[PDB]
Amino acid sequence: KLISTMPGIHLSPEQQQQQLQSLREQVRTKNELLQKYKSLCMFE
Amino acid sequence: NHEAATCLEDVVYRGDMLLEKIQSALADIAQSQLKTR
What we know:
Structural class of chain B: mainly alpha
Family (chain B): Belongs to the Mediator complex subunit 21 family.
Radius of gyration of chain A: 19 Å
Helix content of chain B: over 70%
Structural class of chain A: mainly alpha
Radius of gyration of chain B: 17 Å
GO cellular component, one term (chain B): nucleus
Number of strands of chain B: 0
Strand content of chain A: under 5%
Distance between the termini of chain B: 56 Å
Helix content of chain A: 55-70%
Number of strands of chain A: 0
Oligomer: part of a larger assembly
Order of helices and strands of chain A: H
Order of helices and strands of chain B: HH
Protein name (chain B): Mediator of RNA polymerase II transcription subunit 21
Distance between the termini of chain A: 65 Å
Subcellular location (chain B): Nucleus
Shape of chain B: rod-shaped
Number of helices of chain A: 1
Strand content of chain B: under 5%
Largest interface: A-B, 6 and 6 residues
Organism (chain B): Homo sapiens
Shape of chain A: rod-shaped
């Protein structure tokens, strides 16, 4: 149990789950910013 | 001579519009980088 408490809920249930959704928002926002940069048509 | 002068005034402002576009793009990238925090 001392070996397996490394994977223990140190930061609590609410924070671990929220962090996951925060990273989801971060990753998705990175995705549309990068795709809008690649997809923009500056040239006439 | 007058005609020759017009040539350069036609050439210019294309670099200016490209420059304002790329400044807008880099400002947007910097803003996104600071807001993602």
